[PDB]
Amino acid sequence: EITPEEATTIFSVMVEWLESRSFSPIPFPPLTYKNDTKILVLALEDLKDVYASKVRLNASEREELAL
Amino acid sequence: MEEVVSNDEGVWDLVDERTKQRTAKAYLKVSEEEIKKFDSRIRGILMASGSTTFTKVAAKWNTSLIS
Amino acid sequence: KIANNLKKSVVDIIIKSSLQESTFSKFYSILSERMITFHRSWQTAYNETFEQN
Amino acid sequence: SYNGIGLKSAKGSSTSGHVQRSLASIETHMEKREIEVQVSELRDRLEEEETLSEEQIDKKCEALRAKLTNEWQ
RNA sequence: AGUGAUCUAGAAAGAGAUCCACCUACUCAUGU
Q: Is C8 helix (H, G, I), strand (E, B) or coil?
């Protein structure tokens, strides 16, 4: 449904915004990223928040809790 | 407003951050979509309680009522 | 339908129960305003309890 | 629903439906008018006392009007 | 100077993966 001219104007105003704000791009996380294990323990406390109170566990929930 | 009337707990006193005076009253109601969602949530509490203990029905009512 | 011999004590219960809570809420104000606009004796009771406080 | 306040039915709300009342609730113009009045009076007088003919009454009336005019500057 | 406005209500057989907030928490140098 998107015409090419719409797509080029979208990309043009996004380049215009991200350069008007001098936005440096998000890097790929390095091998030795500084805050890395804190990001990991946040992403895993986000996952155990489902599995702290429930009792009935199927194959996939038990498998990911083991992960 | 013609007559400034002190009103219910559901009104908000909008202090002007320039002159430090209550200059508008924002009146609150709960939106009809959220009222229907709460009704559907209590209906789900009734419907998932096929054969459920009475204390768990009470705890579901307390959870949805506090929420 | 409380007679005059307890209305000051009722206003004191309203005061001392407004002060239990963490912050001030408008509920006690709306309450007290309707109580004052009902009858003259409640207005004299709030006069006497502000002076008392 | 007495006074149009209460429910359609007590059945449906699962309440008692016990609705209870809340205990918490110009000079020139004037001159002209005067002149007119005078004229009218004159006419009346004429009608009363010997003035079947128009010329007489009209004459007298005219005279009166003139007098009035004279009086008011 | 205020009255007054009060639904429900239980028996038989059958059914039914439950899935979530009510206790706080940090200061020795024996000497030179």
A: helix
d(C-alpha C47, C-alpha C8), whole Å: 10
CA angle, corner A57, sides to B46 and A41, nearest 5?
110
Cβ neighbours of D54 (radius 10 Å): 10
Task: Tokens for C31, please give them.
Answer: 């309450």
* Buried/exposed A15-40: b ≥16 CB within 10 Å, e otherwise: eeeeeeeeeeeeeeeeeeeeeeeeee
Q: What are the structure tokens assigned to D3, written together?
A: 């006074």
Which residue type occupies A17?
W
| Block residue for tokens 């001098």 | A22
Specify the 3-state DSSP secondary structure of A45.
Answer: helix
In chain B, count H helices and then E strands.
2, 2
Q: Do B8 and C25 touch (CB under 8 A)?
A: no
Amino acid at C43: Q
Whole-angstrom Cα distance, residue C27 to residue C4? 24
Do you know the residue count of chain B? 67
Technique used: cryo-EM
- Encoding tokens for residue B25? 């009253």
Residues with CB under 7 A from strand E: A 53-56; B 48, 50-52, 59, 62-63, 66; C 1-2, 4, 38-39, 41; D 1-3, 5-6, 10-11, 14-21, 23
Comparing CA positions, the residue from A45, A52, A53, A51 lying closest to residue A63 is A51
Resolution in A: 3.7
- Cβ atoms of D35 and D41 closer than 8 Å: no
